[PDB]
A paper describes a structure:
Parkin has been proposed to function as a RBR ligase such that it encompasses both of the major classes of E3 ligase in one protein. Our structural, biochemical and cellular data indicate that Parkin functions as a [name]/[name] hybrid. Parkin likely binds E2 through a conserved structural motif on a canonical [name] domain, and also functions through a [name]-like active site cysteine whose activity can be regulated through interaction between the R0 and R2 domains.
To gain insight into the RBR class of E3 ligase, we grew crystals of Parkin-R0RBR (residues 141–465) that includes [name] 0 (R0) and the RBR domains. Overall the two structures were extremely similar; however, the loop containing S223 was visible in Parkin-R0RBR but not in the P223 structure. The R0 domain (residues 141–216) is a previously unobserved domain fold (based on Dali), while R1 (residues 228–328) shows the classical cross-brace arrangement and Zn coordination of canonical [name] domains. R2 contains the proposed catalytic cysteine (C431) that is near the hydrophobic interface with R0. In our structure, F463 is involved in critical hydrophobic interactions predicted to contribute to integrity of R0:R2 interface. As is common for DUBs711 in our structure C431 and H433 are not well aligned for catalysis and implies that a conformational rearrangement must occur for catalysis to take place. The R1:IBR domain group contains the putative E2-binding site, which appears to be obstructed by a portion of the IBR, that we have designated the ‘tether’.
Author numbering: 141 to 353, 359 to 378, 393 to 465
The structure:
Amino acid sequence: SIYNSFYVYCKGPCQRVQPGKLRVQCSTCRQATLTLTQGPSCWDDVLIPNRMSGECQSPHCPGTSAEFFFKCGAHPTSDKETSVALHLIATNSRNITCITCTDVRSPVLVFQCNSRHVICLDCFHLYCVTRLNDRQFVHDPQLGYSLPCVAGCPNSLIKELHHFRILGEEQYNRYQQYGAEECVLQMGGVLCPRPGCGAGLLPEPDQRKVTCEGCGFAFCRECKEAYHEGECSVDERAAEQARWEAASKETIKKTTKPCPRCHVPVEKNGGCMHMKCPQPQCRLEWCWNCGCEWNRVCMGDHWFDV
Ligand SMILES: [Zn+2]
Ligand SMILES: [Zn+2]
Ligand SMILES: [Zn+2]
Ligand SMILES: [Zn+2]
Ligand SMILES: [Zn+2]
Ligand SMILES: [Zn+2]
Ligand SMILES: [Zn+2]
Ligand SMILES: [Zn+2]
């Protein structure tokens, strides 16, 4: 790829976040024969069922609805070996600094708070690991546990929980255990402190000696050491800058570009990368990013960008 807009979680063989390929088919016959009236321009166009329409080219098909899906892009995949799109992950083409480390990194994760706060994937990982350690995940009745924007913005819980799969197997399994453990702790219990154990334990609440009976560890529930007698031994400017829609400096890529064929300056007016030259006698169709005739590789890698 010259450029990727999209990231998926590849469940096998990669077992990690990868660049993804976008596909559309006819929702009626399920073949790749749907010519869209208008190309996708944002996540809602490709995630909301039946949102986009066109015409199915299959002879005896009346289908007019699009169905979009994604595949891992790191190796060959079959026609419909699909993967879940991690729609919060964006390529950082405008060099936005990260809300917590202030470095320019790519890809980044964009929270769905009003501010659309930006955090790099390393800090997102660190943020999850910290919150797990400190027991700071947030409960949602219709979701389970998740995290809001790091800046604490309202209405910003991650809803698509495959985004936590990017923590990789061990942190992801700590995340998965969180709720069971939390139930124990709300009830006044205690987790075994032995690394690799962590059983949830519900001893009589006035007992200082807790025996894990898992691993047999007898501990002091106060200091968490082996049982003994006697006494135990976001920056404010960062969060203004690290916002997806905040005004930015000019990059090497211009926001007004010449048509590849007729050289007349063209303005882009939404998220679709498929441009149609507005000049009557030109009408070249081209990729805004790659500056070449519109094609299926551009479709797959970056039909739209955020
Ligand atoms: Zn893969
Ligand atoms: Zn069809
Ligand atoms: Zn960072
Ligand atoms: Zn926020
Ligand atoms: Zn234990
Ligand atoms: Zn103690
Ligand atoms: Zn032109
Ligand atoms: Zn392109």
